[PDB]
Design a protein around this ligand. Structure first.
Ligand code: CA
Ligand code: CA
Ligand code: CA
Ligand code: CA
Ligand code: CA
Ligand code: CA
Ligand code: CA
Ligand code: CA
Ligand code: CA
Ligand code: ZN
Ligand code: ZN
Ligand code: ZN
Ligand code: ZN
Ligand code: ZN
Lengths: 397, 400, 401
């Protein structure tokens, strides 16, 4: 059971739940219905457990990528907003919340990687990657460096690789093509090669992770870094006079960073579908709804569309939205588990000298068609595990 | 060495073989060629073992589903009956004996699930599933159950789940689509939802297996049950006044049971292809042939139109055919094995409460895909080893 | 790290590397560029190990089939010959060197099976396969046989299986179809029936391999054998008066044996790509280039038209070329590994009577799919999980060692 009447909501700890409950109070003054906002620990792991048994929250707030696997299990119900409501949110944020063609959640907040620069050492950030080598030699002569960001992660290095033409899976007609992997193409090729060049030319260090790079920017040792909204707090406390802006273009093409849309999904087994429907649409996805959640903990950029235009006064946020629009939306499929492991090695192999661009990229393509496609076969290890649970609980109890 | 100049036929022991031999005796008089009718134990296991080597019978009689794997291993030869003789049989039976878009056997007899009811407790059977909630409460007043059938098996529950639009695999233009599974669509969902509700409204028991149901019906405790023609014999002994009829409809759609067509196939190694074709086309699949087999032991509903309109005079046989023309033919492909296991769990989990209708059905489609490609793994490791196991050890943290 | 300003060519020791070196030092006097021709052991397995790390030769010479796996790993750079140069070579040789719809190597030599016969025992060799029954019992009267070739290996028996319609995969519009197999079709069926009928009519023996076949023709016991140009050296030794010709036809259709094209690709990591394209186009792939390679160790049938029409004076070489033009180019895809193993059992099980024609070829079409995919799986993880654990062991020494 999931209690017919009260709307129980599950949101992550680090989000503005008090600002959400503040909205949940204005709901119960209107149609009377009591709202309980719980923030359970490891809820992205508890939800797939209790929801399967027909329990859990009415509404779940989490990053869209994880909703795919939920929608695969039939844990989420198809939402029903009209063409009128669908337009007061950003067109692209609707592609983030679709599975098999059905819409399975409402978009809330967008999050993308942005260029972060020290105004003191560089009052005018570079619009092209091409000029970064030349810029470094200008700064090295003064002891500083041009750019420092996490090279160990594909999430950070992908924007450059993807820039010219690289992509995870082809998204066309509101659906994902798992037999169309663009990690090997001419765009990803020249992309990685350029990164590899900036490494052997001695402009970036192959061993740089997240800690080394953030510390360097928060020390004033580097003029630029690539990072998202989460880092902004630390950069305040170090008191570095910094600005956030659009990502540098490569070959005359904008960098395409991955998009992280926070979304609200309705439980399939919830009996209060028309109440959640009323909750999220009429109230939360208006200025007054979001403004309440924002004041508790900032959401960054938002899907509505009236309200972000108001927030867009802060350049930092307007820079997140602008990067989010030019980027590709992080695919919500189980084959995305693969792509990550394929590219993480490909970027690390190529950057160290172990393999070449051509080689390490073409190797990754085979490794994707290995991982998540065989890991798919290891799903039957749980199907055939039920034989274990059956052979004990049908025989006896 | 099948001795070029004779026909040796394999048919199961329970089946009316003495009748087949009579038609083999008739065949002999006319052509001068001796026909043998043999019934070895587990012939459906022995056949592919000897047919492979180029040994065994010229004609093997068995349920069409098993012919899927035979056709695969090329043990069966393509039949070439002209269009004239095709219209002699029912259209939907020709879809049962078709592999890779090719005809690989002759249809003989149709077996399908039906609604069997106690004429005394219920002189008029419901024509809708939706009515069974009401009908139970009326009979629970006289100390009787309305409906009791095997709920442990998908074979029995499927007629209700498929009724709204669910399907095993998609069949169009003589071909099955192994990527088009209709287990989790809109139809199957509301189907299982109804079957689940009848349980949580206490109209049925989640624990009811085959035995319980047949015992509950045979002693006169329950009014109705779902079962095939194999069960009639026992009900006679129990002297309960029963009748067989078409399954109840759900949302104005007929129930879709599985159809097991008994068929005769010609061996690919057989040197007497033309004599077999002469025997099955001109002597067995006629009024005079099938009547003789049926006179030994009943075939039930037959694929031949002229003789079916004669057996249908018994209400029970006409009901099985009625239910058949409304059912989906059981797929003879190997992916069918996966379908069973996935659905068997799905129904059991939904019927116990473990998982919801929406989740259990979606998860069965991930099971049907995973278990099906994992069967290739077992079969590759098996047939690679016979050319000269788990391989498990998959290994992260990366969150901080 | 491949050494800029100079060339380094790899070719197998068995081939005319000294002939190639002559063309090497020809290119020197004319452009002032040092061309080193090395011939190292198991180079066909060493190349993907050094080219992966961005090292090795500039040009590699090997049979095209192995390039598919090289092109997969991206080790070979796309070649750009214009349509003017392309027409110098036979059209079919361009299909042997194509991956993902891209040309990745320059075709040098062509290799195929041919019908070899004894002109003493049999002056006029049979045109069709169907007349080999009638011919066998004639020679059996003298105390000889008509034909004996290696039945153990599909590479040998395939010309007959494929003759009526069978194919490995469907090559159309510059790419192969891994889901279109022609192993159990009505052509392959009748093909293999005929081979088996010859076995159970006692015209051939099911236990015959390469050694049996070669030694039996080399001692004049059999009138015919099917073998390629590599065998010729041994038949020149045996002093047997022998002829090479086009393969017999089956049901009016010519036998389609497999084609092996020796070809030269350019390394992806090579900095001298326009020099490699200079040496291979203007110097080597001309008759004066191939005249020198051929003089060292004969290449057999050459891809270049002009020089081919000169070598065809040898009736043996002329026949080898004809059988290639009738043949299908051996698919360079990784699924090919399976095809062999599937068809290897099919032919052996069909010859031994352990299975019928129909039954044996139908297992091959299932085995080929079952192996290739589920073997291609395993190989991915072996070469991933063994390099995943190798990763943390470095980290253990970056702080300890
Ligand atoms: Ca509205
Ligand atoms: Ca400056
Ligand atoms: Ca406001
Ligand atoms: Ca886009
Ligand atoms: Ca008569
Ligand atoms: Ca009544
Ligand atoms: Ca009569
Ligand atoms: Ca030219
Ligand atoms: Ca000359
Ligand atoms: Zn909490
Ligand atoms: Zn530089
Ligand atoms: Zn009720
Ligand atoms: Zn050597
Ligand atoms: Zn003969």
């Amino acid at each position: 059971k999931i209690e017919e009447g009260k709307l129980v909501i599950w949101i992550n700890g680090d989000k503005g739940y008090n600002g959400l409950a503040e909205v949940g109070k204005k709901f119960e003054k209107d149609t009377g219905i009591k709202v309980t906002v719980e923030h359970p620990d490891k809820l992205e792991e508890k939800f797939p457990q209790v929801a399967a048994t027909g329990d859990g929250p009415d509404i779940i707030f989490w990053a869209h990528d994880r909703f795919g696997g939920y929608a695969q299990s039939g844990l989420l119900a198809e939402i029903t907003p009209d063409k009128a409501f669908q337009d007061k949110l950003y067109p692209f944020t609707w592609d983030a919340v679709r599975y098999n063609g059905k819409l399975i959640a409402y978009p809330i907040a967008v999050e993308a990687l942005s260029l972060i620069y020290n105004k003191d050492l560089l009052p005018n950030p570079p619009k092209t990657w091409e000029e970064i080598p030349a810029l470094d030699k200008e700064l090295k002569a003064k002891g500083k460096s041009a750019l420092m960001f996490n090279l160990q992660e594909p999430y950070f290095t992908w924007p450059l690789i993807a820039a010219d033409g690289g992509y995870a899976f082809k998204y066309e007609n509101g659906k994902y093509d798992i037999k169309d992997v663009g990690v090997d193409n001419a765009g990803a090729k020249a992309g990685l090669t350029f990164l590899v060049d900036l490494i052997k030319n001695k402009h970036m260090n192959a061993d740089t992770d997240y800690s080394i790079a953030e510390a360097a920017f928060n020390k004033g040792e580097t003029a630029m870094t690539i990072n998202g909204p989460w880092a902004w707090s630390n950069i305040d406390t170090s008191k570095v006079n910094y600005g956030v802006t659009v990502l540098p273009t490569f070959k005359g093409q904008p960098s395409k960073p991955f998009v992280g849309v926070l979304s609200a999904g309705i439980n399939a087994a919830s009996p209060n579908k028309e109440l959640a429907k009323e909750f999220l649409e009429n109230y939360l996805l208006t200025d007054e709804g979001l403004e309440a959640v924002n004041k508790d903990k900032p959401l960054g950029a938002v899907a509505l569309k009236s309200y972000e235009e108001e927030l867009a006064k802060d350049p930092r946020i307007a820079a997140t939205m602008e990067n989010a629009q030019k980027g590709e939306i992080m695919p919500n499929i189980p084959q995305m588990s693969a792509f990550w492991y394929a590219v993480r090695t490909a970027v690390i192999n190529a950057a160290s000298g172990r393999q070449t661009v051509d080689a390490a990229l073409a190797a990754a393509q085979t490794n994707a068609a290995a991982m998540a496609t065989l890991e798919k076969l290891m799903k039957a290890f749980e199907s055939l595990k039920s034989f274990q649970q059956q052979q004990q609980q049908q025989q006896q109890q």
